[PDB]
RNA sequence: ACAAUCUUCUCACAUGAGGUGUUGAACGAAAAUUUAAAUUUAGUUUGAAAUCGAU
């Protein structure tokens, strides 16, 4: 069946879609999850992919498995179908496009509030500024 | 009263140089095994930007007497001698009193004291504590946080490495500091077999140890 | 037909990816050929006959009596052994030594690849010890790669009885 | 008093001052003369910064944050054996405790855990203006996010007196790096400094805040407050006028 | 042919640097 | 431990003396005019 | 083809402005903010470490 597989020590800027390709070189991968931040997206450089076959992804092991590349050891082991999951799989050969969140935060600051909209966002500030002041 | 720091072999030599480092402004005394020793780490430490005296020179009984002499008047500053070197001299009013290796006299060690007092002693040699049960003498440990100790062993080894009378100084210091230790009398306290030898020459500013005959 | 494992060691060589980064690495460390020391003496003596410091040396250690006392002193921090030296007894002895001493070792493909990082025709054997501060980091890589792709693999098969 | 009409200072750096006190609550071998650090939080109307700037802002101040006894390392262009020719003609030994230059720095050490090691090996960290913007890289994280923020000192001269004058001035100046964001943090000091001297260097820091940082200047500026690593942030000044600002 | 990973990787870091050369 | 019990010899922390040997007729040779010099090397 | 352009300083008048580049993971204090997630951000760990968690 599919042959799950998630390397480890893999060489900074190994890209997914690069990863892949290299991958699929030696054998085709169903699927391709990569690892990333929550929020930044930063890959733990993971290769937690999932290849075609579980006998391509054996022969792709051996001869992955402790390759000095880029000066770190491929320590690439195939990953067993137990351990492989449906989560496992989700978000398999997708890209982690990330939103400028400080943009974002900066364009909402940004944005302008109405007096309405200023009243609303102040709230309760004085009480809050009260219940500090009364925590003090 | 007796300080005591658990401190192993490899790190002994990095927590005196933090030790050394943090009351540079203080006067302090440090007792070692070794008269080869005194010379090495006064070698070494002058070497490193760390003016300290000693008590060897050049093998000249005048100077050791001028440079206790002058240790005396000085109120601030660092020394290094024997056991045997301080053995009956006046001990003058010293902040800071402490013996690198375990010394070779136990009943005389407790003897002197009787500033503050110090012990450089391995995890595997704690039985010298237990001696001190039988000596009834009130001792204190004192614990250190090693993530604040200085690493300056990736440069200590390097420069050993590449200089000759301070490599000539070190072998022959680790050697009579191995023959003092073969040397000791009480065996079931420090044992030679049990040290790790090892971590003994990591101190000394060796990353592998010499081969020195026995 | 059967073969002592004394021998048998040599047959499984090291990989075809390790042993380019071994010598990509040992490249920067050939030892001066004699064209250009030539030259590099003759700048010192037209220095010394007008009117006139330097640094240690930096090259990889070559030389079977010359390899093994750096290997007893363990001076070796990896050795390099090539797997068909005309009468195998030279390094037969050479991976048991490597292996009592503690120093990392490799038997690489052919001695005419060892024998050009030494500007010589055949070299039977390479040590490296020093190694210059900027790639101190890299070195220890590859002791990890040989001590990966020949400790931790092989290792059984060093025992066995080959052929 | 050019904040909001009023200077409530003194009063409240005292008042914080005595709580800290009072908060009060072997150690030979790991014995420090380190203090409680001032950490003052400036509000404001509006996004101070824009985008990540990895340079701390020298913010001269009367009383000095970083004590003395810090070893500070400095990273100049090559050669080396010229700036530290200069260091050792300029008797800063004691200061100046080792210099590396940019290239070596960069190429001799690289690893994540070397990095490191130097990192802790020196207190304070001070780079040379000609390569000042390189310090983000060859760095990392492993200096930049880990409390290591070089200190931009201006050695291009080469001058004795110069490098006196940068080392004193970086010595008796504030660090502090601007970030994308409508507030800060500025670190005032230690506990050990005078409720008198802590009021001087807030006000230094607060003037050079609304000149240099705070595009509005105090106008700007929505609410100030002070407190220790772990005290509550009492508002040192809070603007009255932040209501029709706003709006 | 086969290609070796590293190969790709080098054009990678390349687009990455000529991005930033080019900002 | 290492095996070699014998103390570290001058030569492996002096600068060598093999070509510190080789340098001297080497200056004889420049001097005499024997060897043609590294400037006139360039203009031959 | 594991090779490539991450600047070793500029402009204006001793002074001002400028240099856009940061491994990952894990631990963790309480702050100021913005329209529940998002920005900054104390202080640490680490072989350029890694076995889903993508927002």
Redesign the pocket.
Known sequence: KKGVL???????GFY?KQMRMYFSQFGPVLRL????????????????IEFESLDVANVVAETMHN???????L???V??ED?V?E??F??????????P??T??????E???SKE??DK?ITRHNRKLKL?KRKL | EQGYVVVDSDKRFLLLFSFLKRNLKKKVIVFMSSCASVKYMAELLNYIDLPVLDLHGKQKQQRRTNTFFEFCNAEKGILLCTNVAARGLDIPAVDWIVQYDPPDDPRDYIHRVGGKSLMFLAPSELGFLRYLKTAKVSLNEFEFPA?KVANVQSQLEKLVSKNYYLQQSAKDGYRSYLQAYASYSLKSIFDINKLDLAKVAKSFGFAHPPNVNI | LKVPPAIAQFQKTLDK?TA??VF?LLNKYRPETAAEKKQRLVAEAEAVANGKVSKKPYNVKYGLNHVVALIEAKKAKLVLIASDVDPIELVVFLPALCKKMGVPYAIVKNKARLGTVIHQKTAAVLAVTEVREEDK?EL??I??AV?ANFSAKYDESRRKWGG | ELLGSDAPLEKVCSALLEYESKRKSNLLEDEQDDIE?V?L?????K?I?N?????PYKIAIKNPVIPSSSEACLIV??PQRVYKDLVNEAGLSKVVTRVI???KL?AKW???????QLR?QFDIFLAD??????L???????F????KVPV?V?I??G?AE?LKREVVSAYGATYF?S???????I?CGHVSNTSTELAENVESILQFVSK?IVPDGAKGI??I?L?T?????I?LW?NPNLKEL?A | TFK?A??F???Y??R??????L? | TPLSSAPEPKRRFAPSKHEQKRILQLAYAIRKGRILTSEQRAER
């Open positions: 998630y390397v480890g020590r893999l060489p900074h997914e999850r990569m690892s990333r931040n929550r929020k930044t997206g930063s890959s733990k450089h993971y290769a937690f390759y000095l590349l880029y000066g770190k050891l320590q690439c082991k990953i067993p351990q999951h989560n496992m989700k978000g398999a050969d997708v890209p982690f496009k990330r939103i969140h400080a974002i935060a900066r364009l909402q600051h944005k302008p509030l909209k200023a966002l500090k | 993530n | 990816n380019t980064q990509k980091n220890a890589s002791v990890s001590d | 650090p950490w939080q400036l509000a404001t109307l996004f910064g985008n990540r700037k990895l340079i262009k090559d230059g940019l290239s960069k690289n690893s994540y855990e070397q990095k490191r802790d203006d000609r390569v000042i913007p390189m983000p890289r060859i760095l990392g994280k492993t930049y996010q880990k409390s931009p201006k291009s001269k001058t110069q790096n970030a994308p964001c409508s507030s800060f943090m670190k240099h929505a609410s407050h407190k690593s772990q005290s509550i942030a508002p809070n706003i | 070796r590293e190969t990787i080098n054009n870091r390349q990455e640097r000529e991005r930033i050369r900002n």
